[PDB]
Structure 1
Amino acid sequence: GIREKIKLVSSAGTGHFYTTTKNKRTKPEKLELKKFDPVVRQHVIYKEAKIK
């Protein structure tokens, strides 16, 4: 289980976040995907942040 977990946070400014896994050795760059925010009820860009 080398592949650590992270949370994609909503750029909408809501609390909402998705959580997921990524391999931090092979992929140093941050994960940015366009995911559905269900509070805004729109598809927003979600940027990787630390799970904590």
Structure 2
Amino acid sequence: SRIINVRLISMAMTGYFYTFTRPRTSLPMSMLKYDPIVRRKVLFLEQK
């Protein structure tokens, strides 16, 4: 209940995602990850 599992959706609209955990009483996650569909580092943002 204290920790939630979020989904970091790629901003290349390729449908790839990364799942990381973070506390509810925190800000949304945002990272620069490697999208294997386009094979390039793009911006991944939390789903909601």
TM-score normalised by the chain length of structure 2: 0.88
| AA in 2 matched with 1:36 | Y
Q: How many pairs are equivalent?
A: 48
Identity of aligned residues (%): 35
| AA in 1 matched with 2:32 | K
Structure 1's unaligned 5+ residue stretches are none
Q: What is the CA RMSD across the aligned residues, in angstroms?
A: 1.2
Query: More strand by proportion, 1 or 2?
Result: 2
Structure 2's unaligned 5+ residue stretches are none
Q: Runs of 4+ in structure 1 displaced over 6 angstroms?
A: none
2:6 and 2:23 map into 1 onto residues whose CA distance is: 10
